[PDB]
Design a protein around this nucleic acid. Structure first.
Ligand SMILES: [Zn+2]
Ligand SMILES: [Zn+2]
Ligand SMILES: [Zn+2]
Ligand SMILES: [Zn+2]
Lengths: 791, 791
DNA sequence: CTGTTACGGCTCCATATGGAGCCGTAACAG
DNA sequence: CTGTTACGGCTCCATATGGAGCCGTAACAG
């Protein structure tokens, strides 16, 4: 009725816990990273609600949506349909923009049709219908095409065509025999240079024969057939239109340009003649949300116009107010939804959900406050509480103190992670958790544990990285200086351009200069001080592997030492074994039946592929003869089965393994097991693995680390550990640059660069620079204002 | 909040109506057929709720579910997600049965794992996993295959292979050249008879070469290639497994047989050794729902077993009780869900929804009481009220008096249909509608209008249709006699076998004997009295056309007369025109640009095909020169634009057109227009069109009409009109047999055949026979008991 | 004029190879 | 012993023609 009773929850590492979540209330789930709160929420409640709603729909719709796996839960009662909002974005299609996603373009079209004065039909203003879409660009506004300068950057035999699937290097490839047939038809030499080729022949080859029929001969068996040359450009365009990695690869060689006729207006030349208050539809859509709302509020109409357009104006004002209160007062209604970050997309989805007014729906949010400045926390909390107040329930998974102080109910898991977590430690109001003596969240909220402000701060040693003439996006031609050898943190409000300035300019230029990559840096003049750097490393939450053949033991490189010490035993020496025998990636020591994968594929008549453990090897991925070899009473499979904490004690007598295992333990991965597949690892686990690998390396003092919000989905203890690890890395001799919005991390940094003073058009500048104490003295700085009370 | 406010509803024929539907209440929508209530419910509320829930899901899930069209409504507030339940069934896959659909097989597996005594793992009892599925049948229980007796029912050149896609009649077809290559390889003559062919050669041809590689030569251009013969049977099996019309066609030639090892148990020989109370899993699943519930209630366990299996037993008992209270006390848990009727599937879905306990969801049901006997009305109403009471709202679209008397709120549309309906006439409680003087439902509920019991009933003239030895399904070898020349109605409780006995036996045998069709009748001895019949006609709600080239004017045949009178004018005579010129199906009088379709196809870069009216012809489907010809001030397009009611007055001077138009008016289609596409017609409109076509024919007195519940989705006035039409058809000279569950239709019949006395195993017999007055005197008959008070 | 049958024409639905990232191994320099 | 570079091998992901039903037309019988 008024509760969500869950019994027998055993998904992932949950230790058969029973919980009662009050309905129509603000509920937050807390715990350490990997403690199972994310599993308990998403894999149980969201999955059960989505399955219960989908299975009751039409058969075709259910088949299209797929067959969701049934969670390992006894029974759940009082479960309304669940909608999950998380930081995930897709390119999707160019047809969708911010206005269409937020469902305000329809209201704008209705208003323009009803009251717009021509210089009147709602479908005339839409670019998704032939009645309004521009004839040339088909309502897209961007004539995407592949320029000839990129297809042929040398004769054909030297590798002129760099496009995938058109490599004429192979003699028997389709491209080779098509080129041979074309050369036979047009009587030209393939080995002739492209520049020396006649323009007509080159144009015919590039753009095809335009439907002309030619004879093509193919040899395996021999035969002949009649067909036509489609052309490289036409085939690439058709492949692009047929269907995200392939889309990104195709768009890499593309050259986006504005439509020559509509100039990106996406509409016919006659639809733009209708204006409201001196601004047509495109000009209104080009304004930022705040100024558009101000213009709508200040708009003056006659009595008849006000009576005929009251409801549309009220709806537009309400939606714009919701969007502003969410925090996106800098975005434009005409901006493409594809070029949006995860936090911006999540906030837009939240605003749309608030505007829709759906009732009786369980809402689950995964860290809505990440990627958002501290000044917008109150607005975000007010929006969340309004969404709850409209007749819904919230299951936010957050680790922010303000969220705990604003939430009605708090559920805490733990007390550790992995095999030590998965059970509820404490629950109730914030006061009850604060008074609870066995809760980590209560301990960190009551002041028992805290992050201390360092007494001594490092200073630059005379090495600086100067970026000159940065003008990409909203950057107003600013020059910044990043000291080398100290912990540098870059702050600023959302949309100020810090993320672009770092990721798409500094990292790309450093990679091109040092790692010898092939990327296009952002619009800037030059970078000074690169000679002081030897390598650039970027650490993110991307998975460390896409195959089941990768595990942390191999990634950290400790598996080589483990195999060496295994082969150094007397049994392997007497049996003539090698260090490579104890590996599930090379034939000789792996199971032959399962090919070392450990699972087998079974095909059903009317079901997808089902995987079961291999019968002969029992999932140990090794043959019996190899497994007979034991080192100190444990075989290779048992060693792979140990966790990092146990491996620390087991391998304490071998320094070369002990150092790596201790690094893995210190980066907070003491609950993980060496045999875990890299595919099953989460973002935090992958980031910790990368940090451990970086720590295990021998630093030369000329390395730069770039991190983009490393505190995503991290508890207070995790933040403390990450701060300690970053300080250790800085003290090693390298330099660390972090884009952070967390005050706890910010206050421990040695240098702070602030970008503001606003977001969007008003941003792109530099407000404050120096140590946090110096930045706190700047009056016109939000970060300084917050650090004034934080310190 | 507590209301669903809809403003500006203009979908289909709705005349801009505003309504307020109370939330969490029993609401019923009433109106005439075609008045727009179905549109107002499904196209507006269900569509808006489904779109609002889908658009907030993941991008991939939203793309898979498709892009739902936005309804033509201003705004809807307080809209919870909507689930629509309607009478629609699909073959789907053999993996799903009644138990799996109702989610009781999982609980049965859990109970068997926990307390079953072997002679213990939940996944061992499931047939959807390799751990429990039978190795031979792969957990299907039916080895579906194509028998050789059906592939070759004459030499190859005479058409031995009757399978689609393997017609060797064409010389250049792939089948022909494959057969030629096989004949060249094996050195045999294709023209040789199949019987005279060696068994080895025939087996090799039928089952392929089993991977053997042979040389195949093909001619258009000439060439050769190496491949293997897959075989007809293997190719057909692969095509069947690749992917409903094609599935039905493939299954027509299939021969379903039980698995030789498991005997249809779908499980391994070891999983059936576990028994509970002397019955294993398959034997429990083979019992009917009522007796299974009785067995579970009477089951005795020890204290430990009761303590360990209390929750599972309680859940199973509750679900079985819900299923029994729904009305399906005769179904078996092991029955395949594919072989279920629309009403049974809808009731099963309702029971599953009740068991799931989803809260805050709007439920829309389309005639849940159709196909259900009168004795189950109270149980169905109680189930609906319980489903509402668990915290939901109901939007049932029903025309049953008991539903009106049980509903909290009633919304009435009308007052007519088509252009006369689409607006709300009255609303409120049942008393308010009864006291309303301008409501058709109130008029029929207050006794102002009623269907009178006929004073005189027709009697048989000595012609009878005797079915001897009917034994299909649950029929217990019964003999029935259907009189010819009178209105015969067949009644009985659900599951008594009347539907099978009629549709799959009598209609099929009559079609085979008279219409010279190719179908397999049900298991019966013979039928006597066929010599008194000349033709058999079956009328259902299936669409009358699948192309936009069919309209009621052509279907009824009146369009030929219209074209003839158009060509008989002086303008056509002077211009040398013919009767075929005024047709949008032959070149010469239709628009060349749109090819007479009236619409054009426009392709977008990243959108599906969009259809817009043709520019040159303005959607009139005719060229200008043809349109210049006018008859009595109206051209052909204007004539097509007229409705039946207007065409009745326009064509009153031509008897050959007036008779057909009057028939169309009398069958209740006075609101439809002659130019309406047959694809857009609903089931009721198609049935009315078929009835009008049958009436327009010249009856020879030797025709039999078979109707299966013609009162589906019909108001009381529609029922009265249909009864009048059926009586007119009977008085014409033919014989009508109707399977009906409506007491109003039953009381007007001349002969009644009752099948009972129960459903399932207890059915398949004949209880009462004779006139309704005679049937009402039978004590052990539910239909007689109801007719006792009805008459 | 009307019903039936046969034929022609139309429409909608159905049915294998190259590339990026990672692991293991050998060689060379510090 | 350790770091770096180069190479080989492995895996997962990506990119047109026959048939059923209907409409129009002509011929034959009542
Ligand atoms: Zn354009
Ligand atoms: Zn194996
Ligand atoms: Zn079997
Ligand atoms: Zn046209």
């Amino acid at each position: 009725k008024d509760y969500i009773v869950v019994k027998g929850a055993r998904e992932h590492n949950l230790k058969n816990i029973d919980v009662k979540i009050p309905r129509d209330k603000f509920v937050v789930i807390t715990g350490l990273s990997g403690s199972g709160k994310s599993s308990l929420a998403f894999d149980t409640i969201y999955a059960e609600g989505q399955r219960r709603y989908v299975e009751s729909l039409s058969s075709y719709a259910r088949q299209f949506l797929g067959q969701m796996e049934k969670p390992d839960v006894d029974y759940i009662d009082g479960l309304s349909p669940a909608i999950a909002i998380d930081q995930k974005t897709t390119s999707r299609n160019p047809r969708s923009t911010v206005g269409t996603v937020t469902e305000i373009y329809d209201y704008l079209r209705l208003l323009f049709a009803r009251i717009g004065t021509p210089h009147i039909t709602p479908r005339m203003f839409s670019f998704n219908n032939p009645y309004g879409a521009c004839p040339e660009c088909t309502g897209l506004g961007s004539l995407m095409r592949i320029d000839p300068d990129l297809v042929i950057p040398l004769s054909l035999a030297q590798g002129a065509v760099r496009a995938s699937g058109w490599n004429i290097a192979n003699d028997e490839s389709y491209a080779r025999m098509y080129i041979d047939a074309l050369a036979k038809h047009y009587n030209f030499s393939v080995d002739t240079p492209v520049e020396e080729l006649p323009p007509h022949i080159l144009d015919i080859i590039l753009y095809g024969t335009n439907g002309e029929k030619i004879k093509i001969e193919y040899e395996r068996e021999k035969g002949t057939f009649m067909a036509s040359f489609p052309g490289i450009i036409n085939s690439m365009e058709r492949r692009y239109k047929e269907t995200e990695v392939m889309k990104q690869y195709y768009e890499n060689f593309m050259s986006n340009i504005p439509c020559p006729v509509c100039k990106g207006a996406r509409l016919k030349k006659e639809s733009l003649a209708v204006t409201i208050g001196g601004k047509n539809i495109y000009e209104v859509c080009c304004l930022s949300i705040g100024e558009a709302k101000e213009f709508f509020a200040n708009l003056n109409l006659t009595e008849r116009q006000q009576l005929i357009a009251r409801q549309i104006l009220k709806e537009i004002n309400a939606r714009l107010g919701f969007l502003v209160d969410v925090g996106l007062d800098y975005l434009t209604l005409a901006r493409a939804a594809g070029t949006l970050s995860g936090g911006e997309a999540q906030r837009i989805r939240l605003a749309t959900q608030i505007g829709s007014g759906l009732m009786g729906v369980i809402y689950i949010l995964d860290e809505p406050s990440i990627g958002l400045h501290q000044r917008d926390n109150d607005r975000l909390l007010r929006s969340l509480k309004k969404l709850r107040d409209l007749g819904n329930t919230l299951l936010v998974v957050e680790h922010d103190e303000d969220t705990m102080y604003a939430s009605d109910y708090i559920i805490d898991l733990g007390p550790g992670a992995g095999s030590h977590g998965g059970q509820i430690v404490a629950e109730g109001t914030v006061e009850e958790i604060k008074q609870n003596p066995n809760s980590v969240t209560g301990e960190y909220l009551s002041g028992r544990k805290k992050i201390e402000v360092p007494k001594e701060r490092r200073k630059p040693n005379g090495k600086w990285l100067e970026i000159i003439g940065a003008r990409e996006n909203n950057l107003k031609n600013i020059n910044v200086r990043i000291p080398l050898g100290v912990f540098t943190c870059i702050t600023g409000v959302s949309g100020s351009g810090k993320s672009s300035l770092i990721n798409e300019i500094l990292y790309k230029r450093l990679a091109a200069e040092l790692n010898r990559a092939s990327v296009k840096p952002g619009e800037h003049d030059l970078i000074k001080g690169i000679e002081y750097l030897d390598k650039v490393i970027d650490i993110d939450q991307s998975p460390i592997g896409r195959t089941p053949r990768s595990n942390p033991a191999t990634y950290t490189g400790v598996f080589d030492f483990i195999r060496e010490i295994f082969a150094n035993t007397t049994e392997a020496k007497t049996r003539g074994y090698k260090a490579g025998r104890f590996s599930f990636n090379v034939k000789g020591g792996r199971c032959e039946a399962c090919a070392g994968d450990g699972i087998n594929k079974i095909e059903m008549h009317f079901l997808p592929d089902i995987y079961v453990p291999c019968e002969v090897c029992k999932g140990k991925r090794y043959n019996r003869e190899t497994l007979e070899v034991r080192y100190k009473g444990k075989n290779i499979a048992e060693v792979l089965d140990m966790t990092v904490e146990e491996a620390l004690e087991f391998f304490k007598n071998i320094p070369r393994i002990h150092k790596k295992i201790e690094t893995l333990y210190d980066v907070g991965l003491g609950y993980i097991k060496l045999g875990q597949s890299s595919t099953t690892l989460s973002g935090g686990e992958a980031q910790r693995v990368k940090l451990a690998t970086e720590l295990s390396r021998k630093s030369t003092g000329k390395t730069m680390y770039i991190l983009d919000e490393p505190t995503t989905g991290l508890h207070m203890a995790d933040v403390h550990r990450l701060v300690g690890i970053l300080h250790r890395l800085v003290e090693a001799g390298n330099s660390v640059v972090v884009i952070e919005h967390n005050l706890d991390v910010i206050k421990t940094a040695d240098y702070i660069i602030d970008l503001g003073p606003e977001g969007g058009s008003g941003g792109g500048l530099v407000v404050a620079e120096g140590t946090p104490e110096e930045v706190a003295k700047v009056e016109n700085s939000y970060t300084g204002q917050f650090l004034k009370k934080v310190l």
